[PDB]
RNA sequence: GCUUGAGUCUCGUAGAGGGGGGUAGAAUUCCAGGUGUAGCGGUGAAAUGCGUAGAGAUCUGGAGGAAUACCGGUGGCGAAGGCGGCCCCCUGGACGAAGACUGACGCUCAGGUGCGAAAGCGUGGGGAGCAAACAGGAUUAGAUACCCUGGUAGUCCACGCCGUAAACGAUGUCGACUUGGAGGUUGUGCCCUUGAGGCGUGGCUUCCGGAGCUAACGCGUUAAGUCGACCGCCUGGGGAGUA
RNA sequence: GUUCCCGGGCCUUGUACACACCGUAACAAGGUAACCGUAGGGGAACCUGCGGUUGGAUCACCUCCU
């Protein structure tokens, strides 16, 4: 269930506080962190007709979150894609 | 999901009379409060309370007659999907007058008769009987 | 030691337990007459043979 | 399972065997599986298991016979 | 109604089996969460621990094979 | 003082509290107090029990359940009212028009016994007029000579005799029904909530109704 | 620009949830050995078969194979389908006490994509039990039908294809609103968890009922009650959910 | 004495029945409960195996502990 002493390091970087993980720039990164440790499962085992609903779920959530940041703050979005590299 | 405040507020009115209460409280906006202003002058609402801090709790005291609803047959006509404009002479009357056709006019909030007083129409929000 | 012959085992308490209401006063157990009154009065319940 | 009792019997005493299962697992591993069957019959069984308690609630309020 | 589930808090262990004798019969049969005045949580966790006590030879399966 | 503090008729949880509002009251292991709605609702009760009597009114007492079944017979004999201490037969207000067929039958039996042929027939049949007439006592003796409708009916129960309340809503006649908090707020005109299955309330409420009839005619 | 909407983190729990592999024990088919009998099996009844070439039965050792009695609870997980030993690793989803924020980032659909019990088949292995086609004896005027003994396909492990259902609490989905009781299952905050609890809040599910709907039965906070948003379907049956 | 046997009544359960009890596969539990989905087969209904549901029936007797 998540890797706490890696993700807390992430909120330390992106956040202006330690309690501030409500800003778009920090939350999508914690979401990508989930995906960084999710690759480890979608590489092996092959028969996850259950774990598949998690993929489509968190990817949908992520696609539209960066889809709003794009429509409002291009300052934070271009800095965000340049801060984590979540574009590719 | 509570996208049309007006309609799901009239439900608090509908089921409110069916559940027999005395006071309803819904998220506020002074446009809805202006509707209650018109309703007090007519006798549908009694003493509207615009109490608010940072989370606007408009508290409206529901009125009865002889232990019966004065506002019983009420529903939405100009839906959030089907918003329909009306003129001044094609304008409808709830209960042919024994009820008010609440219309949002070019000035603020009034009735079918008060819209005749303005000489201009608009959104017949709902049929109030 | 009977409720039908004398009275409520407890204050307004029926023999069978049909009346576990300390509001019930007078109404008897229709099976056998248990007029519910305070059990303390059973220190004054006079019967006969 | 194993009943003994050194002397006061004058009887076989297999009452804990029946009090164990006896026909409990006999009726379950003697004939065809048919995975779904018990589920349905426990259905009619459960509704009739609440029915006697419904009869317990049916005897407490009136019965002024 | 018993002074043991009024002092029984947080997962009853699998080491000494003296109190496991108090949930099983002297046959190797477990008592359901309804007979024993114990919430399913507890009667069930005690149970899983007992299967592990079988992989450890604390309690056998049925009495005799 | 609140009548030795009994007014509140303890409320049994399974009471299903629609009446929850009006009752208020504390909650003791089951629940319990019907407070307010009970106490001051009798003052306005006294008011109407005076006015319907000012229009010449009688109270057909409708009581069952063995507890008040005794003061019903006495509170009726205490003033001038008719009573139903025994079983309140379903139809004694609506089907009463056809109960009248038997009322004329009862008034003809009262004839044969008093000034009839209770000494001009087989002892076998004379006793038939005897045992049956006593069945007319427990059934129709408290309405033997009505003719006209009473102006108010005292309904001892709603939790059990809501039908007695329903048939009243067929004549639209004043109902002075005492209730429990699993009953309907409709049908009753002057509700007197709270305790009703208490011998003390029997003395208290029923006596205060017959006595209030006594001053409307005065 | 501001928050009652959506969402994530700090701090935690439970689980027939899925996935790859390995392992424990009983029973069964069968093999070797000591003992031993003439019956075992089956059905309303008979019979095929086995039997002095010693079956069934008992004890010890053991190799394939599939599946987990008792714990089991109109209980739990999930989009649904569907799914009951244990361990190691991976991991999705649901929920909660107290705070921090961008500030409606929300809902759904033709073409499209993915899951898909069981079955059919191709392929490297397999066959204990049951058992399509079929054979023997009977019920029968007849058996390709209830029954029993055998038995190919299938069942299982891994990769794919046609891509189907009573895929049905028959109740489409996101969400708000609408007197209670018996409960069950899983967490949490407050008070002395002295104690088997009292007061509130979310998820799933069952029974009796008010409001309301209804042809009626009844559903009834998980609705068939009240609205808004998005899609599919129907115009009597059959033809046919087929060429 | 009502447990055996013939006829009768009341209550109750059940029905696609009310025109009203070549082979029985459904309607009483039709003496083998039903239907959908799939493969195969036989003059033919339907049956066999696997998954699901209730648009299914009685829970009445005979032996043991308080």
mmCIF file of C-alpha atoms (C1' of nucleotides) in Angstrom, chain B residues 4-14 26 31-32 34-36 38-39 42 44 60 71-80 82-86 91-105 108-113 115 122-129, chain G residues 227-228:
data_model
loop_
_atom_site.group_PDB
_atom_site.id
_atom_site.type_symbol
_atom_site.label_atom_id
_atom_site.label_comp_id
_atom_site.label_asym_id
_atom_site.label_seq_id
_atom_site.Cartn_x
_atom_site.Cartn_y
_atom_site.Cartn_z
ATOM 1 C CA UNK B 4 -30.692 22.927 -10.435
ATOM 2 C CA UNK B 5 -31.098 24.511 -6.948
ATOM 3 C CA UNK B 6 -34.577 25.869 -7.737
ATOM 4 C CA UNK B 7 -36.198 22.486 -8.601
ATOM 5 C CA UNK B 8 -34.627 20.454 -5.793
ATOM 6 C CA UNK B 9 -35.662 23.240 -3.364
ATOM 7 C CA UNK B 10 -39.280 22.886 -4.467
ATOM 8 C CA UNK B 11 -38.852 19.238 -3.489
ATOM 9 C CA UNK B 12 -38.054 20.423 0.054
ATOM 10 C CA UNK B 13 -41.378 22.232 -0.299
ATOM 11 C CA UNK B 14 -43.296 19.294 -1.809
ATOM 12 C CA UNK B 26 -31.123 25.420 1.705
ATOM 13 C CA UNK B 31 -32.051 35.825 -5.989
ATOM 14 C CA UNK B 32 -33.876 32.980 -4.249
ATOM 15 C CA UNK B 34 -36.019 37.813 -3.616
ATOM 16 C CA UNK B 35 -38.452 35.060 -4.601
ATOM 17 C CA UNK B 36 -39.324 34.620 -0.915
ATOM 18 C CA UNK B 38 -42.532 38.174 -3.388
ATOM 19 C CA UNK B 39 -43.957 35.130 -1.611
ATOM 20 C CA UNK B 42 -48.560 37.224 -1.325
ATOM 21 C CA UNK B 44 -46.925 31.823 0.748
ATOM 22 C CA UNK B 60 -37.440 29.805 5.218
ATOM 23 C CA UNK B 71 -48.189 25.502 -1.397
ATOM 24 C CA UNK B 72 -49.153 21.940 -2.354
ATOM 25 C CA UNK B 73 -49.093 21.591 -6.150
ATOM 26 C CA UNK B 74 -45.723 23.077 -7.104
ATOM 27 C CA UNK B 75 -43.206 21.987 -9.748
ATOM 28 C CA UNK B 76 -40.717 23.283 -12.326
ATOM 29 C CA UNK B 77 -41.801 24.434 -15.798
ATOM 30 C CA UNK B 78 -38.750 26.227 -17.177
ATOM 31 C CA UNK B 79 -36.290 23.314 -16.739
ATOM 32 C CA UNK B 80 -32.474 23.802 -16.631
ATOM 33 C CA UNK B 82 -35.695 23.315 -21.365
ATOM 34 C CA UNK B 83 -35.579 26.989 -20.377
ATOM 35 C CA UNK B 84 -38.557 28.572 -22.149
ATOM 36 C CA UNK B 85 -39.064 32.296 -22.748
ATOM 37 C CA UNK B 86 -42.558 33.824 -22.776
ATOM 38 C CA UNK B 91 -48.006 34.231 -20.445
ATOM 39 C CA UNK B 92 -49.661 31.447 -18.318
ATOM 40 C CA UNK B 93 -51.422 31.764 -14.939
ATOM 41 C CA UNK B 94 -51.244 29.129 -12.185
ATOM 42 C CA UNK B 95 -54.741 28.053 -11.149
ATOM 43 C CA UNK B 96 -55.839 30.728 -13.623
ATOM 44 C CA UNK B 97 -54.836 33.223 -10.940
ATOM 45 C CA UNK B 98 -55.317 31.344 -7.662
ATOM 46 C CA UNK B 99 -51.628 30.548 -7.891
ATOM 47 C CA UNK B 100 -48.679 32.590 -9.110
ATOM 48 C CA UNK B 101 -46.502 31.882 -12.125
ATOM 49 C CA UNK B 102 -43.133 32.881 -10.680
ATOM 50 C CA UNK B 103 -41.109 34.467 -13.493
ATOM 51 C CA UNK B 104 -37.526 35.785 -13.536
ATOM 52 C CA UNK B 105 -37.894 39.160 -15.261
ATOM 53 C CA UNK B 108 -35.422 40.825 -10.887
ATOM 54 C CA UNK B 109 -38.057 38.428 -9.512
ATOM 55 C CA UNK B 110 -41.844 38.872 -9.748
ATOM 56 C CA UNK B 111 -45.137 37.295 -10.844
ATOM 57 C CA UNK B 112 -47.197 36.936 -14.026
ATOM 58 C CA UNK B 113 -49.292 39.941 -12.972
ATOM 59 C CA UNK B 115 -44.653 41.075 -15.278
ATOM 60 C CA UNK B 122 -38.941 36.068 -19.577
ATOM 61 C CA UNK B 123 -38.349 32.829 -17.650
ATOM 62 C CA UNK B 124 -41.490 31.323 -16.118
ATOM 63 C CA UNK B 125 -39.408 29.457 -13.531
ATOM 64 C CA UNK B 126 -42.257 27.482 -11.969
ATOM 65 C CA UNK B 127 -45.974 26.894 -11.401
ATOM 66 C CA UNK B 128 -46.779 27.619 -7.743
ATOM 67 C CA UNK B 129 -50.111 26.328 -6.424
ATOM 68 C "C1'" C G 227 -36.466 15.984 -10.052
ATOM 69 C "C1'" G G 228 -32.360 17.223 -13.412
#
